[PDB]
Curated annotation (Swiss-Prot):
Reaction(s) this enzyme catalyzes, per UniProt: ATP + H2O = ADP + phosphate + H(+)
Gene: DDX17
Protein's recorded name: Probable ATP-dependent RNA helicase DDX17
A molecular-function term among this protein's GO annotations: RNA helicase activity
Tissue: Widely expressed. Low expression, if any, in normal colonic epithelial cells (at protein level). Levels tend to increase during colon cancer progression, from very low in benign hyperplastic polyps to very high in tubular and villous adenomas.
Section of the entire sequence shown: 119 to 554 of 729
Domain Helicase ATP-binding, first and last residues per copy: 84-259
Organism: Homo sapiens
Family: Belongs to the DEAD box helicase family. DDX5/DBP2 subfamily.
Amino acid sequence: KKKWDLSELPKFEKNFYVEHPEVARLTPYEVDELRRKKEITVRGGDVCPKPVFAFHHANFPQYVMDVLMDQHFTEPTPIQCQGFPLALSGRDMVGIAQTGSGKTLAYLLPAIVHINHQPYLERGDGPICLVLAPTRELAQQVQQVADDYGKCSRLKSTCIYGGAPKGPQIRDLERGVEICIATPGRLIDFLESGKTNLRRCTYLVLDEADRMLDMGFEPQIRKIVDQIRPDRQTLMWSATWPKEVRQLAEDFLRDYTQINVGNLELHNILQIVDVCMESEKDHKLIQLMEEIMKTIIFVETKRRCDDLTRRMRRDGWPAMCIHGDKSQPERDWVLNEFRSGKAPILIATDGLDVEDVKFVINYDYPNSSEDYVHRIGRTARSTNKGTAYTFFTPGNLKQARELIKVLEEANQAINPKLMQLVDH
Ligand SMILES: [Mg+2]
């Protein structure tokens, strides 16, 4: 169905999470410390339940708990600690974690509970849980885990992938499976021939979405997901968080929360360069803060640092500067005024970080690309919708080449007037 009326589809539930009292009694500070010591980050802004820190906090059925304790795990992984409550609460979610973090259990055990709260499969029914994987190897791993944890509940799962004979896969699909772990191409083949359907799938998992996009599976993935009811529960997992994965998540998920495990690495702010001439900067710059509805300006000098600060304070702007020649009491005081909000405009020639960043203005482009990219990194490592402005002027060609290389590696939208400089 390309368009849906969900009131005609069978009803189903998603929220089965019963929070454990040992987790409920955690104060906000204790929850924050627990997330920090496990390197767990929640975007914004988002509505996310408290993380668990023991398997029995999840209140799993005793067969899953039996196999889990038979694995002799000392503790759940951080991605599990934060994804078990999210998934068991029926929330669509995005998980930014590397491989080996334990995401498989994190999306598979809630899938088992989700299926257990549903009626049995009738003849011809498709799978209830669909896990899309980029490679055959990952699909086989996930299927092995799913059979390890679903055999006691008598759940039937299958692995669908190309390069293998179609006979056993068709037989598994026609005899009925509640969990299907598929690669896109073979699954599309089976769907078009009617060997399986998605009318029953209420639990969608997109494993390694970044790899799936990088290998050219986006049209196939979209064709598959278009046939699944939109009121489903969707869990996307990726090792990176670039523009393509963000767009895929906004397209496939509804009211989702994004969580990160490990350090941020690479993060996405609207890096915009404008090519001007020198004496046309100030105008634009004043423009660049007459739209302020918070702001860090970078220059080359300490001389013109103080000069620009004094000139914009002459014009009436609440700007304050910081550099190496200033004392440390003055530095701490200026930073306090910046964080509290009196002086929302900081001007600097540079570890030390501030959290609330709405605009970054490299008033004069640094002489490197490394001096440029780490400013954006320090800014985007915080949670923001910031926009980094830079004032470039067409004097240097190699400089523009390096800047364009950085912008292309950042998946940014280079304005045509900067590409026009090395076009010919
Ligand atoms: Mg394949």
